[PDB]
C-alpha cells in the first residue's frame, strides 16, 4: 500500500505568513497527489486534484507543488478563513490513502485566562454527588494547567478536563475543569481551589471558595 | 448540484450488524463509482470501500474485507453499506463520498457524514445542572452521566449566542458528560432569565434548567 506521510502534524503560524504543507509518498506517484480542506463539524472540502490542479472555487492564495515524492501545499497568507485540518490523497494506486493530517492554529497575541469557580448545585448535592466546576476562559496559548487543591492540599483524581478548539473569532481557547467527588466527602471539607499556570503570567492565577 | 445524504448510524452492540444508506442527487448516479470512508479522531479519514458505476466491482482494504458489503441500486440512486460482526475500532463517521471516475479515483464529492458507535454501554439520559454564581457575569450549566453521544446545548434557546462556550464531552468509564458556560452583562442578571437546553436525542430527552442565584 503506497504509504503517504504527512508533516508537519499541527503548524501555527500568524496572519499574512505563509503556510507550507508537505506530503511524502511511499513510493512514486508521479503527481496522483490531492489535496482537501476539512473545517470543524464539516466534511471535507476537495481543493486540489491530481496535477496540482486547483480545484474550482477555490482561492488563488493555495497551490499544490510537486511531482513523483514530494508534495506540498501551501498558502501565500494565512487568512482567519483557513484555520482548518488539511488532508492529502494519493489517488494513484490502491487502496486509496490518506495523510496523518495537518491542523493550523492562528498564533496570536498572548492573553490570560478568566478563571471562574463554581460550588456543586442544591439538586447534584441530592443525588448524592459534588462536581466542582471550573472555567478558564479566553486566554492562548492552548498550553496551561489547572490544579485541584481542597484545603490547601493537593488533589488529582476525578478531575474532567476539557478544551475547546480554537475560537473563531478572536483565536482564543477556553477550558473547562471539572472536580468530580461524593456528597460525603465534600461536605467534610471547606477550602475549595482551582489553581492555573499559564504562560500569560507568573504567579499561578487562583480563584476560590470555601464552606 | 450534487447531493450525497446518508443515513443509519446508531449504537450497534460488538459483534452486531448494521446497515447504512446513501441518497445521492443532482447528478447522474450510474456514472460514477461511489464510496464510503470513514473518519476516527486518532486515525483521521480512511478508506472503507468503493463500487463501480455498475456493481460490476467492488473494492474493499483489507481490515474491513469480509466484512463491510458496499452495494448500490443505480433505480434508487441509492448507496448501500451493509456491515457485520462490529468491532470497537469500527466506531467513527461514516461519509459517502463519489469519486469523479466510474470506477475509483480521488474524492470530489463528500456526504453530511452519519456516526456509528460500537458499544455494550447502554443508552442514558444526562442529569443537567446549573453552574450558578455563589463587568459580566459568567453561568454555566453542566450535563453529565449520558450516552451515546451527541447531546445538544443551547441558550435561551438559541436567542443568546454570544459567550457561549461548549466543550468537548469526555469519556469518564462508558458515560460522557459535559459543560457549556455563558457570559451575560451583570445588569441582565439576576433581572434577566437565563435557561440552559440540553437535548439528548439518543434517549429522546429534552431538558431545560433555568440558572437561579443559589
Ligand atoms: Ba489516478
Known amino acids: 500500500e503506497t504509504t503517504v506521510t504527512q508533516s508537519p502534524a499541527s503548524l501555527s503560524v500568524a496572519i499574512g505568513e505563509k503556510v507550507t504543507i508537505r506530503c511524502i509518498t511511499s513510493?512514486?506517484?508521479?503527481?496522483?497527489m490531492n489535496w482537501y480542506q476539512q473545517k470543524p463539524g464539516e466534511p471535507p472540502k476537495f481543493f486540489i486534484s491530481?496535477?496540482?490542479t486547483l480545484r474550482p472555487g477555490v482561492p488563488s492564495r493555495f497551490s499544490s507543488s510537486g511531482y513523483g515524492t514530494d508534495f506540498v501545499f501551501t498558502i501565500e497568507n494565512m487568512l482567519s478563513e483557513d484555520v482548518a485540518d488539511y488532508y492529502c490523497?494519493?489517488?494513484?494506486?490502491?487502496?486509496?490513502?490518506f495523510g496523518s493530517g495537518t491542523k493550523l492554529e492562528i498564533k496570536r497575541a498572548d492573553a490570560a485566562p478568566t478563571v471562574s469557580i463554581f460550588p456543586p448545585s442544591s439538586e447534584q448535592l441530592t443525588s448524592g454527588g459534588a462536581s466542582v466546576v471550573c472555567f478558564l476562559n479566553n486566554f492562548y496559548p492552548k498550553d496551561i494547567n489547572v490544579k485541584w487543591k481542597i484545603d490547601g492540599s493537593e488533589r488529582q483524581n476525578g478531575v474532567l478536563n476539557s478544551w475547546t478548539d480554537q475560537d473563531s473569532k478572536d483565536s482564543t481557547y477556553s477550558m473547562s475543569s471539572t472536580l468530580t467527588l461524593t456528597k460525603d466527602e465534600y461536605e467534610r471539607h471547606n477550602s475549595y481551589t482551582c489553581e492555573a499556570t499559564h504562560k500569560t503570567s507568573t504567579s499561578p492565577i487562583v480563584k476560590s471558595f470555601n464552606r | 448540484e450534487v447531493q450525497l445524504v446518508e443515513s443509519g448510524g446508531d449504537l450497534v452492540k460488538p459483534g452486531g450488524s448494521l446497515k447504512l444508506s446513501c441518497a445521492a442527487s443532482?447528478?447522474?448516479?450510474?456514472?460514477?463509482?461511489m464510496s464510503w470512508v470513514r473518519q476516527t479522531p486518532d486515525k483521521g479519514l480512511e478508506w472503507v470501500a468503493t463500487?463501480?458505476?455498475?456493481?460490476?466491482?467492488?473494492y474493499y482494504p483489507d481490515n474491513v474485507k469480509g466484512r463491510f458489503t458496499i452495494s448500490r441500486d443505480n433505480a434508487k440512486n441509492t448507496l448501500y453499506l451493509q456491515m457485520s460482526s462490529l468491532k470497537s475500532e469500527d466506531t467513527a463517521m461514516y461519509y459517502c463520498?463519489?469519486?469523479?471516475?466510474?470506477?475509483?479515483?480521488?474524492?470530489?464529492?463528500w456526504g453530511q457524514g452519519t456516526t456509528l458507535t460500537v458499544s455494550s454501554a447502554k443508552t442514558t439520559p444526562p442529569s443537567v445542572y446549573p453552574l450558578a454564581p455563589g463587568s459580566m457575569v459568567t453561568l454555566g450549566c453542566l450535563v453529565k452521566g449520558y450516552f451515546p453521544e451527541p447531546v445538544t446545548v443551547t441558550w435561551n434557546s438559541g436567542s443568546l449566542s454570544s459567550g457561549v462556550h461548549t466543550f468537548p464531552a469526555v469519556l469518564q468509564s462508558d458515560l460522557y458528560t459535559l459543560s457549556s458556560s455563558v457570559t451575560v452583562p451583570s445588569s441582565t442578571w439576576p433581572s434577566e432569565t437565563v435557561t440552559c437546553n440540553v437535548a439528548h436525542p439518543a434517549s429522546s430527552t429534552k431538558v431545560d434548567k433555568k440558572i437561579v442565584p443559589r
Open positions: 463520498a463519489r469519486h469523479e471516475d466510474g470506477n475509483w479515483n480521488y474524492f470530489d464529492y
Open positions: 443532482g447528478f447522474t448516479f450510474s456514472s460514477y463509482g
Open positions: 463500487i463501480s458505476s455498475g456493481g460490476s466491482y467492488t
Open positions: 513510493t512514486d506517484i508521479d503527481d496522483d
Open positions: 491530481e496535477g496540482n
Open positions: 490523497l494519493q489517488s494513484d494506486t490502491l487502496p486509496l490513502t
